Motif scaffolding. Structure first.
Motif, PDB file in Angstrom:
ATOM      1  N   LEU A   1       0.883  -1.194   0.000  1.00  0.00           N
ATOM      2  CA  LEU A   1       0.000   0.000   0.000  1.00  0.00           C
ATOM      3  C   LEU A   1       0.907   1.226   0.000  1.00  0.00           C
ATOM      4  O   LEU A   1       0.867   2.031   0.881  1.00  0.00           O
ATOM      5  CB  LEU A   1      -0.945  -0.032   1.205  1.00  0.00           C
TER       6      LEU A   1
ATOM      7  N   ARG B   1       0.459  -4.821  -6.286  1.00  0.00           N
ATOM      8  CA  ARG B   1       0.031  -6.143  -5.799  1.00  0.00           C
ATOM      9  C   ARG B   1       0.699  -7.216  -6.661  1.00  0.00           C
ATOM     10  O   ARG B   1       0.779  -7.048  -7.880  1.00  0.00           O
ATOM     11  CB  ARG B   1      -1.477  -6.249  -5.889  1.00  0.00           C
TER      12      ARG B   1
ATOM     13  N   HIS C   1     -10.101  -2.397  10.529  1.00  0.00           N
ATOM     14  CA  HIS C   1      -9.629  -3.302   9.477  1.00  0.00           C
ATOM     15  C   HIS C   1      -9.814  -4.794   9.835  1.00  0.00           C
ATOM     16  O   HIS C   1      -8.842  -5.567   9.958  1.00  0.00           O
ATOM     17  CB  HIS C   1      -8.169  -2.977   9.162  1.00  0.00           C
TER      18      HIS C   1
ATOM     19  N   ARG D   1      -9.286 -11.809   3.571  1.00  0.00           N
ATOM     20  CA  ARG D   1      -8.665 -10.509   3.324  1.00  0.00           C
ATOM     21  C   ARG D   1      -9.207  -9.416   4.261  1.00  0.00           C
ATOM     22  O   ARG D   1     -10.364  -9.512   4.784  1.00  0.00           O
ATOM     23  CB  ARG D   1      -8.850 -10.116   1.866  1.00  0.00           C
TER      24      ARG D   1
ATOM     25  N   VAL E   1     -12.164  -2.489   5.129  1.00  0.00           N
ATOM     26  CA  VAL E   1     -12.461  -1.333   5.993  1.00  0.00           C
ATOM     27  C   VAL E   1     -13.869  -1.399   6.520  1.00  0.00           C
ATOM     28  O   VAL E   1     -14.811  -1.422   5.738  1.00  0.00           O
ATOM     29  CB  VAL E   1     -12.232  -0.021   5.211  1.00  0.00           C
TER      30      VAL E   1
ATOM     31  N   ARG F   1     -17.049   0.153   7.583  1.00  0.00           N
ATOM     32  CA  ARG F   1     -17.793   1.401   7.278  1.00  0.00           C
ATOM     33  C   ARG F   1     -18.919   1.727   8.246  1.00  0.00           C
ATOM     34  O   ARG F   1     -19.219   2.901   8.494  1.00  0.00           O
ATOM     35  CB  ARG F   1     -18.366   1.281   5.855  1.00  0.00           C
TER      36      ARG F   1
ATOM     37  N   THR G   1     -17.227  -2.470  -1.298  1.00  0.00           N
ATOM     38  CA  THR G   1     -16.311  -3.238  -2.143  1.00  0.00           C
ATOM     39  C   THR G   1     -16.666  -3.071  -3.638  1.00  0.00           C
ATOM     40  O   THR G   1     -17.645  -2.482  -3.971  1.00  0.00           O
ATOM     41  CB  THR G   1     -16.270  -4.742  -1.721  1.00  0.00           C
ATOM     42  N   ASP G   2     -15.847  -3.587  -4.504  1.00  0.00           N
ATOM     43  CA  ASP G   2     -15.974  -3.507  -5.943  1.00  0.00           C
ATOM     44  C   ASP G   2     -16.762  -4.730  -6.349  1.00  0.00           C
ATOM     45  O   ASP G   2     -16.353  -5.864  -6.085  1.00  0.00           O
ATOM     46  CB  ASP G   2     -14.585  -3.574  -6.567  1.00  0.00           C
TER      47      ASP G   2
ATOM     48  N   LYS H   1     -14.128 -11.529  -4.194  1.00  0.00           N
ATOM     49  CA  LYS H   1     -14.878 -11.791  -2.939  1.00  0.00           C
ATOM     50  C   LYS H   1     -16.407 -11.791  -3.188  1.00  0.00           C
ATOM     51  O   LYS H   1     -17.163 -12.556  -2.586  1.00  0.00           O
ATOM     52  CB  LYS H   1     -14.439 -10.813  -1.838  1.00  0.00           C
TER      53      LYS H   1
END
Ligand SMILES: Cc1cc2nc3c(=O)[nH]c(=O)nc-3n(C[C@H](O)[C@H](O)[C@H](O)COP(=O)(O)O)c2cc1C
Ligand SMILES: Cc1cc2nc3c(=O)[nH]c(=O)nc-3n(C[C@H](O)[C@H](O)[C@H](O)COP(=O)(O)O)c2cc1C
Lengths: 175, 175
Positions: free
Chosen positions: A154, A160, B31, B45, B48, B50, B63-64, B69
């Protein structure tokens, strides 16, 4: 910045950090998180890192044979291991096969009474009150043979890399 | 002690720590580690935290949508969440069902471009160089509906409790 030397250097750094977990009670690699496939979904917990070998690609933990995590591994040996190392701006995610070996009775004999005693109490996770089991043979090794290391760095920008057996060469991937 | 009072207080402590995690960037509960069932064994993994709701027993992550995941959770919604909080001598392990929901587009509109990029660009994990992915609406909410919390309090000696939805009363269990 993208060279093979950098990738190699990053893997060496990851193993260096595992190494520090075996030497320093206060380092985050002292206390990795191990995930198993449990009875109803994934499960995870902290263990103390006891040994690490870059050459052999192993990480070693000690545990109680009577504990649930050992039952999980007996049925499915596929595990994952995680450490977050914020001072180094590194997340390490590893995939492994966990092998169960007998513990060293010379080490067991060196353990403090409390630790020795806890290996001979009730089955971990049993509702109290519960009967004990004075079986020193509960002292067990988990040798985790790593197959993949995914490392997030990071920095600016985030980088990565993923390293996979048998080649272990490393590839840059999108964070 | 092992009273009902201590049991209740210990779960309250857990929720106060999740609370600190949403507010304090330097707190370990900021985290937590999320475990899923992956393609070939367990995976975990860092995310964060929220938001957290003691009353609904939920934890929320962003997340994306294109990340692995999410694909994991599509195939198996069962997840586990872990935090090690050394300063509080607490380990928390939580079983949950994860729901994937659309993000709030007004919040997405309000994020910095550095943050917005967590939900743009290539698919996370893709070997570089990686083509930008054009999926609309990648900003996603991961809501973890907790069903069980297993708390280890590393007092001398350890005590450990397990709490279960919907009442969350608790029982003492062997460490
Ligand atoms: C900081 C810390 C260190 C721990 N070290 C170990 C350990 O090395 N071996 C072990 O079996 N459990 C260790 N535990 C206890 C486990 O996290 C867990 O509660 C216990 O092993 C039961 O896991 P299971 O129910 O999945 O088998 C540790 C817990 C804490 C938080
Ligand atoms: C401190 C830190 C915070 C992170 N926060 C998030 C985040 O909240 N959402 C997310 O998707 N990934 C986050 N990550 C990156 C993930 O850990 C992971 O690399 C990425 O999400 C891919 O996981 P997956 O490959 O299983 O989908 C964070 C990593 C670090 C260590």
């Amino acid at each position: 910045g993208m060279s093979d030397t950098v990738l190699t250097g990053l893997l060496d750094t990851v193993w260096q950090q595992f190494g520090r977990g075996t030497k320093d009670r206060h380092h985050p690699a002292r206390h990795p998180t191990l995930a198993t496939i449990g009875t109803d979904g994934p499960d995870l917990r902290t263990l103390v890192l006891r040994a690490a070998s870059h050459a052999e690609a192993t990480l070693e933990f000690h545990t109680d044979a009577a504990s649930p995590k050992v039952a999980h591994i007996r049925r499915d040996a596929r595990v994952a291991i995680h450490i977050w190392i914020p001072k180094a701006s590194l997340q390490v995610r590893a995939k492994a096969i966990a092998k169960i070996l007998p513990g060293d009775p010379n080490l067991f004999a060196q353990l403090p009474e409390a630790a020795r005693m806890n290996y001979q109490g009730p089955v971990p996770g049993t509702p109290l009150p519960a009967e004990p089991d004075a079986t020193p043979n509960r002292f067990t090794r988990l040798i985790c043979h790593l197959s993949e290391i995914d490392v997030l760095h990071l920095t600016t920008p985030h980088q990565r890399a993923v390293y996979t057996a048998p080649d272990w060469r490393g590839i840059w991937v999108s964070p």
